[PDB]
Amino acid sequence: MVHRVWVETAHTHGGEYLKADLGYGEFPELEPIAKDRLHIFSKPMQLVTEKGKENMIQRGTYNYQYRSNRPVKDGSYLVTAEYQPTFRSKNKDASYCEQTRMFGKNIVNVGHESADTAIITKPVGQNLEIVPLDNPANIHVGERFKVRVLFRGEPLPNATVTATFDGFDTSDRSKTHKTEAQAFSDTTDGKGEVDIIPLRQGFWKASVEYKADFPDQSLCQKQANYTTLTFQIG
Amino acid sequence: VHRVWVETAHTHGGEYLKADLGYGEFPELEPIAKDRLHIFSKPMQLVTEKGKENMIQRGTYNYQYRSNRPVKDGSYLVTAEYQPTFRSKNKDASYCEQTRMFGKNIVNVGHESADTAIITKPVGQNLEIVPLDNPANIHVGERFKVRVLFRGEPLPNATVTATFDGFDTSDRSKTHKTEAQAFSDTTDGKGEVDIIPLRQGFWKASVEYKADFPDQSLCQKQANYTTLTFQIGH
Ligand SMILES: [Cu+2]
């Protein structure tokens, strides 16, 4: 089971509590975070609004449910989740250390006709980050949704960005646990940007991963980053 | 980056089969340049019940081929090969790399032809996409199973992408994009993957594999780029 990270938000109208969910596992099926994984999510998910980044409270039936501190107004906001860095041993004969980090970012439009770009287009500081350059509410089927990929604050050229949606691939309860089939794939340009072309309406997840050398070679050797951006089309 | 694919005209029973060798950027057919003629030193092959036969290079442009004889209703293969070429590569050192490319097109002659006897048998391409079903039976959103073979054996964990003519067209030029894919997934332990087409049209599936060259005394690395073209819908 690969175990990737993404973020989901329920339909929220202005003035009520924004409920969100931390998906850790196989998209799009949410699952409770296991006992041996809790230390990985030591820091709660964050809500990004005009006042900035604020912590969310882990309230709900399951341990992956979060609720906003105060009610939220209409606008376009971000919900971010982080898999805190973990170290593990790998090989291939001269085993080595790898640091895994994962990030999830969800675009949430609180209120109909809300398609702001001021907040959602600003980088939030994730090691590997997908910054939307437009609001998904304006993107119809067949239109292009430009995003930028940033690694360590700089644009990432030639990075493979894939994208899928809930209901595209429907199989493999647990028999393979393989990564889901993608409905889109393309590489970023020199400015780190790529146009996602959605062919279906629904809840979409875009994904990018980068593997590189760890900065401090005297502590660890490799670093792997998996990042997703979740949004709505239509 | 030039790649190999095959296109076939709409063909009925009793007429010659016209096919085109695409060497370049899909789906723009281009004449094979003077300095590239030696690479395509063997003609495109037509695979039928009687096996593999050479096609005849007839037409205004040098990428155009016809079958030797009029073809009957059925399901046939048209294959093209970019013959192995060696080039030097630097990292710092210098090593030999052999490049080979393959293309295969499933062509149904007759409006009701959905045979599988010919198109599902491997042809012997070093890197090959073997269809396990006829695409004429595949409607939009259904699964089209293929297997990937490398040196005759199934190739697991290989990335297969797919796109169609007309998917990415914006601002295409001699120095631009339109490599965007409408599908991407990895093969399983049996080398099989289900392409899920979301639109009708002229589709191309692609896979590549970089490995060590067999005879390390002569060359070091090998790179294979392989295509499968087909029609979805009518
Ligand atoms: Cu509503």
Ligand SMILES: [Cu+2]
């Ligand atoms: Cu016809």
